[PDB]
Ligand SMILES: Cc1ncc(COP(=O)(O)O)c(CNc2co[nH]c2=O)c1O
């Protein structure tokens with residue numbers, strides 16, 4: 111207990127407003143995170159003082175912009191404990207990162223008979239690129255089954271991954287179930303069968319320490335907007351030996367060395383994978399978000415979210431007619447459904463109380479079908495959320511159930 | 525003469541600072557543009573007040589974020605006079621836009637015998653994707669020759685484009701020569717031969733009115749960072765009938781309709797081409813930049829730059845031992861070389877005087893080889909630049925030539 115939630119919330123201006131006459135209760139951070147003043151003011155200082163194109167060699171502002179951009183790259187490398195800045199590629203988000211792996215690695219290393227292994231809980235960003243890659247290569251897509259509590263057993267991984275598996279793609283933390291998957295053990299299993307492992311870390315990176323050397327993941331993808339950083343920015347980490355043999359996914363300026371009429375050569379890593387003017391301000395702001403989270407401490411944030419999750423699970427179990435999906439040990443989110451109430455109505459009623467949650471399939475339709483549901487509601491937490499906000503959520507859920515129950519009993523007597 | 529350059533410069537905080545003890549003279553807007561307070565404060569208001577993920581249906585902040593994002597899309601449609609918002613795709617920049625055309629259109633519509641026709645003046649962003657597409661399809665890449673003044677004659681276009689040409693890719697305005705290419709006539713020629721036309725408008729969009737219906741371009745690409753907007757944002761316009769038949773370049777959430785285990789269906793345009801959480805803040809800020817430029821008036825900006833260019837050409841012709849490349853009628857930039865002085869040294873010396881220019885190949889190596897030079901220096905203008913800054917530039921060039929000349933004559937007597 112070191113982080114002061116009041117002092118933390120003070121730095122997020124967007125939290126201090128009312129919606130529909132109620133204080134805002136933002137419980138949708140798995141959709142996107144809010145930003146502290148440090149990040150916004152970093153963007154401000156960039157645009158006010160030293161914006162210029164990068165990879166300079168000349169004027170002063172351009173040198174400052176380049177120093178900021180590449181310094182943000184080093185901040186990311188340190189943040190996820192990569193060995194080298196050559197392994198840190200700035201992208202526009204997790205989805206693009208995974209698509210780059212699918213185009214530049216998968217489509218070049220898949221033949222008929224090869225297998226791509228994923229799971230039923232994957233976000234669409236970690237499903238559709240593999241569907242398209244196996245369709246383009248004639249390979250086979252396989253799914254690791256889930257336990258009844260929404261977890262993955264290592265025996266099922268060993269059964270699904272075979273000597274024909276070349277890629278295992280798996281989420282670090284599920285944006286729906288809250289499950290934290292055994293990424294390190296799955297990486298060992300994939301390597302034992304001759305496969306690489308691609309980790310979707312969009313939901314893990316904001317909330318827990320990432321050590322790619324301890325995870326031994328071959329690729330790791332993350333999104334800035336979920337971790338207090340600017341929108342439109344993400345990272346692809348890849349083992350350097352793998353990135354060296356992969357061809358670029360995009361072509362143009364900045365990523366070339368020599369350009370002839372018909373043939374060209376590429377720059378060294380990481381710039382080989384960064385075509386065109388890069389996301390300068392967004393990457394610098396992501397570096398600022400990393401500084402912010404590191405000063406608070408990712409372990410502290412994870413402990414705070416563990417307490418929030420345990421509190422929320424207990425208080426949800428106090429509600430009648432509410433079903434929660436996923437395991438007991440979980441990240442900081444709760445996906446649920448009210449008996450006989452569609453989750454979109456739940457979320458509308460909650461917004462009328464100032465509470466922001468998300469209703470729908472959460473970009474995980476195969477998981478919804480596995481859960482035997484059409485849609486769900488989800489309240490997700492971050493470092494600025496409190497137990498009082500969870501109390502407001504559970505009270506609003508009780509009031510929602512009562513309201514729908516007795517308008518039903520009112521006009522069934524009509 | 526309606527725009528007041530003092531009142532315009534007042535809105536750009538970054539211009540009001542010193543570099544190396546001299547007032548900043550920023551003449552590098554072809555590399556990237558500076559931002560007015562309207563754009564920066566738009567980003568601020570987004571992150572301070574209504575950041576949330578988009579394509580909602582539920583809570584209030586999410587609705588406001590979606591309204592901002594799609595309203596920016598409509599602003600772009602109006603700005604370039606597209607028929608429909610379905611034709612406006614948000615990307616991370618011109619380079620990505622052109623790569624999307626090359627992957628989703630070119631690689632699907634090119635067979636052996638087909639031709640992709642480009643020009644010798646193209647930026648690398650409008651060269652390498654076509655190189656890779658013709659290599660992947662076995663098609664042929666052809667180059668339209670240039671006149672001695674760096675312009676393109678329509679007869680050379682008719683000679684190069686044949687009945688086997690399926691794509692003509694050409695820059696609207698050259699970032700090196702300042703040439704404004706006859707895009708409308710070239711589009712007529714390409715359509716007469718059964719080809720589509722792809723327009724690289726990265727350098728035209730910030731400085732002159734764009735009317736895609738009058739140009740009749742099939743694709744048009746632009747970058748936000750060159751037109752007073754945030755970094756990491758761009759637009760791909762494509763004729764709707766063409767975009768409907770093109771498969772997505774990226775896959776994941778937000779761009780799907782139904783997702784099965786092995787097959788999926790895509791959303792309608794434009795969202796079919798926008799995978800993952802989009803560039804929300806950057807797109808809203810690009811809309812703000814469009815509002816800013818429209819309130820000033822693109823025709824006014826073009827007239828101001830025409831005067832700046834004529835003034836600069838005249839004053840450059842007053843300098844001995846300076847060569848300027850390109851035609852007399854031009855956009856607002858001057859690419860040049862000092863006799864017996866490497867342009868990187870020119871640009872270093874100028875930065876010591878507070879003047880920001882760019883030295884190098886400007887991501888146009890085939891053009892440099894066509895010019896029979898290794899590198900060039902370039903001063904590029906925008907709406908905040910003045911004739912006094914051009915005076916400072918030409919005086920600093922005279923002083924550079926004198927300094928190098930007589931340190932040469934000093935230590936040749938050594
Ligand atoms: C696990 C996981 N993978 C991939 C993505 C998508 O990456 P991005 O969009 O490219 O930043 C998300 C975002 N998840 C959600 C986005 O909105 N609701 C969500 O649950 C995610 O949670």
Ligand SMILES: Cc1ncc(COP(=O)(O)O)c(CNc2co[nH]c2=O)c1O
Pocket residue numbers: 163363385386387388554555556616617618619620647649650695697698699724725726727747749886887
């Ligand atoms: C004509 C032209 N096409 C494409 C691009 C690149 O697009 P983007 O990088 O994806 O925004 C540029 C940027 N031109 C320059 C960028 O730095 N110096 C330049 O001359 C350009 O001027």
